[PDB]
Design a protein around this ligand. Structure first.
Ligand SMILES: [Ca+2]
Lengths: 215, 619
């Protein structure tokens, strides 16, 4: 019977990180943490921390606890309000070609490939840039939606491990299953999913977009 | 060294033997120093004449016996014993004794120099002032010193064949540079050894492996021609590997009385249909555009930088459609005839000594560019755009004399050299850049405008283009309805096959083909059928060219890379400066290339495997 500790942890998880967990996972999790630290009688503060660390490493798809509202993919356009601690399955930059990206990632030198005798036509700072736009594959473990970098969100980067947990909050306009995320609507919690690190590694994500086989 | 030292040395000199690189240079230099008073005489060679004339050298009245050679007087080769292909293993050619000899067709010239040395007390070298020219000079010195070992040898340094230049050369005779001659002897030796060993190895092997395909055909190897081919194969492979990708962009246009204004998306383009579709849908509902920022600043287009051999070779190909081999031929003809300065230089800095005001004045009689040349003088005078390189020998390529009597490509290249020179000595084009930022549903789009105020250098240099892009008036805060709001599709484009100017650029970047030798090596890979020209006219590698590069590259060591040749060419520059001796360079380069050879002989089957992809089975 760890149901007393479970309510206290549930209260904290929601209060501190807006994390919602099923009661059965929470009880099974506390029991394991108690077995792992068998020698001691842990405080609620330490228990709450260790429960949250296990959550960050959990695959939400295996949790079967819906967070995002029903038929969010059925609505063509709308606004989303509230706090959601979701999971990034995969992530990619759509402001840059995947071939260009995979080349740099693979560390191969393509200097001679862009050499021309024709005079340097100095581009504009949004052609010389342009600003990055990450397209996040977000999930509550039941529904899969997309998250777009509507305004620059510097806490997000293409090297975030698949299974990374992120808090999506405030007023967020959505269209055709794509959330228009602004920095004021995103918070990175951390973690990773071992099962996802394998399949949705940045090299594999980009290789699929250029049609590379055995993927 | 000093005037007193020279006058003392010249005492008792009656006849001075002068030798030029070619008869036209001899006829030309003799005509200018003598004021056409020269008296022609015959040599033992029908094409290499003698021009006697009285001249005053360092306070001594002498008879100048001006003759010439016909390029290199001496040929380098291995001894007779190693000359036959089936006489030795190609590996021994890295150590096989090499000798210099005079070919049968040049023996008449050798015998003329020897003949005249008997009647002359001094020797003045008048070969072109480059590395090969100094080496030819030392070939002439060796022949004459065989007759008179105590013969006084001097060297005339000049960057143009004009009365002032050739007269100043006589007042400033110097000692012949053995260092630059030695660097040529080192390059000649390495090229023969690496060339012969690798050529004999692959030609004999591939002729036995692919008899029906490569029968009686020469599969040659060059330490520089190989990395040159490598660039062409590298680019072809890049195109082969390139994956194009569809991108999407929101195009917003606004119609005006005499022109449509196109505002370009600040997000530029997206490689995701849904990402762009979502942003575009936001734009169709509430498409009212608001003028955010109407900014304007002065913009300038830079006049050309002082001309060197590489920029001439590249711009003549791009702008005039004359290939580098022909450009250098015409450029040498115009130099020899006295119309341009020595066209083989790395200098892009005008020396302080050089009077640019006179060179500009000289071009004012022309109907086309004359008025512009006058304009430079009226605006204070020449203000050249200099670079950062100086060989400390020659000035940038420029017109030395005005002529209106040229025709064909000779006229086209002279006109180019004159226009570039005047453009360089002119001012930069000055304009006004304007930009209008509009917001449509929080999405930003930008239209650009240009208004050229003073064309300046552009009025003489039509090879460059700048055009006005006049935008209508937009007030900061205005609201308007755009003509069209579209969601158009695009695709990423691969690189293109290399042009000659593109190939020269790559060679320059990697430090191979230095000392204006780019064309020679591009011509060799063309002639050996390793590369072919498309109608475009870009370089496409042949099956033999392709197979050789991917054959050696599959052996592990990255042989198609220009790093080893660049190191070789770097060492040669050190020999010239006296920063390195010829014996260490030879020992180091030979050891380096003998190792690469030994590894290639060991993995020789890789060459067969790479070419089998094109010619099929073969034993
Ligand atoms: Ca020459």
């Amino acid at each position: 019977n760890v149901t007393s500790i479970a309510l206290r942890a549930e209260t904290w998880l929601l209060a501190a990180w807006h994390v919602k967990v099923p009661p059965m996972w929470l009880e099974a999790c506390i029991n394991w943490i108690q077995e792992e630290n068998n020698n001691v009688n842990l405080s609620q503060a330490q228990m709450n921390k260790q429960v949250f660390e296990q959550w960050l490493l959990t695959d939400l798809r295996d949790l079967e606890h819906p967070l995002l509202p029903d038929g969010i993919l059925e609505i063509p356009k709308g606004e989303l309000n509230g706090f959601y601690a979701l999971q990034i399955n995969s992530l990619v930059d759509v402001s840059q070609p995947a071939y260009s990206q995979i080349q740099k990632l693979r560390g191969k030198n393509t200097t001679n490939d862009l050499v021309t005798a024709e005079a340097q036509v100095t581009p504009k700072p949004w052609e010389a840039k342009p600003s990055r736009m990450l397209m996040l594959q977000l999930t509550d473990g039941i529904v899969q939606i997309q998250g777009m970098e509507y305004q620059p969100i510097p806490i997000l980067h293409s090297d975030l491990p698949p299974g990374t947990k992120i808090l999506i909050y405030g007023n967020i306009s959505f269209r055709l299953g794509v959330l228009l995320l602004k920095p004021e609507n995103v918070k990175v919690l951390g973690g990773e999913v071992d099962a996802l690190l394998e399949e949705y590694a940045q090299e594999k994500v980009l290789a699929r977009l250029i049609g590379e086989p055995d993927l | 060294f000093s005037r007193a030292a020279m006058e003392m040395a010249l005492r008792g000199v009656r006849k001075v033997l002068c030798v030029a690189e070619k008869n036209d240079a001899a006829k030309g230099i003799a005509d200018l120093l003598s004021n056409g008073r020269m008296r022609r005489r015959e040599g033992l060679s029908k094409f290499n004449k003698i021009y006697e004339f009285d001249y005053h050298l360092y306070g001594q009245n002498v008879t100048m016996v001006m003759t010439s050679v016909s390029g290199h007087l001496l040929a380098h080769d291995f001894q007779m014993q190693f000359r036959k292909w089936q006489s030795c293993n190609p590996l021994v050619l890295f150590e096989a004794e090499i000798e210099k000899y005079c070919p049968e067709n040049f023996v008449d010239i050798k015998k003329t120099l020897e003949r005249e040395t008997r009647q002359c007390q001094a020797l003045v070298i008048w070969t072109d002032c480059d590395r090969e020219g100094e080496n030819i000079g030392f070939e002439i010195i060796h022949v004459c010193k065989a007759v008179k070992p105590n013969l006084q040898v001097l060297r005339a340094r000049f960057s143009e064949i004009t009365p002032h230049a050739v007269r100043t050369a006589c007042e400033n005779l110097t000692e012949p540079d053995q260092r630059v001659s030695d660097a040529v002897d080192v390059r000649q030796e390495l090229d023969l050894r690496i060339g012969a060993a690798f050529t004999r190895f692959q030609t004999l092997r591939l002729q036995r492996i692919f008899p029906e395909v490569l029968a009686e055909q020469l599969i040659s190897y060059g330490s520089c021609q190989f990395p040159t081919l490598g660039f062409v194969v590298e680019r072809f492979k890049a195109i082969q590997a390139f994956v194009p990708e569809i991108f999407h962009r929101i195009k917003v246009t606004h119609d005006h009385k005499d022109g449509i204004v196109e505002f370009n998306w600040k997000r530029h383009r997206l490689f995701n249909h849904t990402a762009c579709l979502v942003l575009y849908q936001l734009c169709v509902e509430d498409p009212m555009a608001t003028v955010v920022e109407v900014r304007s600043k002065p913009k300038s287009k830079w006049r050309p930088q002082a001309l060197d051999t590489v920029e001439l070779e590249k711009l003549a190909s791009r702008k005039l459609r004359i290939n580098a081999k022909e450009t250098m031929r015409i450029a040498e003809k115009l130099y020899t005839q006295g119309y341009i300065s020595y066209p083989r230089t790395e200098t892009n800095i005008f020396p302080r000594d050089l009077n640019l005001t006179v060179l500009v004045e000289q071009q004012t009689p022309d109907p086309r560019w004359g008025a512009f040349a006058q304009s430079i003088l009226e605006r204070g005078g020449p203000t050249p755009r200099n670079g950062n390189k100086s060989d400390q020998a020659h000035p940038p390529i420029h017109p030395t004399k005005y002529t209106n009597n040229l025709q064909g490509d000779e006229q086209r290249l002279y006109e180019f050299i004159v226009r570039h020179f005047l453009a360089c000595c002119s001012q930069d084009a000055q304009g006004q850049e304007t930009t209008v930022e509009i917001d449509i549903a929080q999405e930003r789009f930008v239209a650009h405008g240009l208004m050229i105020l003073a064309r300046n250098y552009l009025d003489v240099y039509p090879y460059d283009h700048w055009s006005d892009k006049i935008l209508p008036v937009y007030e900061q805060g205005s609201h308007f309805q755009p003509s069209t709001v579209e969601m158009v599709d695009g695709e990423t484009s691969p690189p293109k096959l290399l042009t000659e100017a593109d190939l020269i650029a790559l060679m320059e970047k990697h430090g191979i083909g230095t000392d204006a030798t780019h064309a020679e090596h591009i011509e060799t890979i063309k002639a050996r059928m390793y590369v072919g020209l498309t109608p475009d006219k870009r370089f496409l590698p042949g099956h033999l060219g392709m197979g050789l590069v991917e054959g050696y590259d599959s052996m592990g060591y990255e042989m198609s890379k220009p790093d080893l040749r660049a190191e070789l060419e770097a060492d040669l520059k050190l020999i010239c400066d006296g920063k390195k001796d010829k014996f260490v360079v030879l020992r180091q380069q030979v050891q380096k290339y003998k190792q690469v050879f030994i590894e290639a002989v060991a993995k020789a089957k890789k060459l067969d495997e790479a070419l089998a992809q094109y010619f099929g089975n073969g034993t």
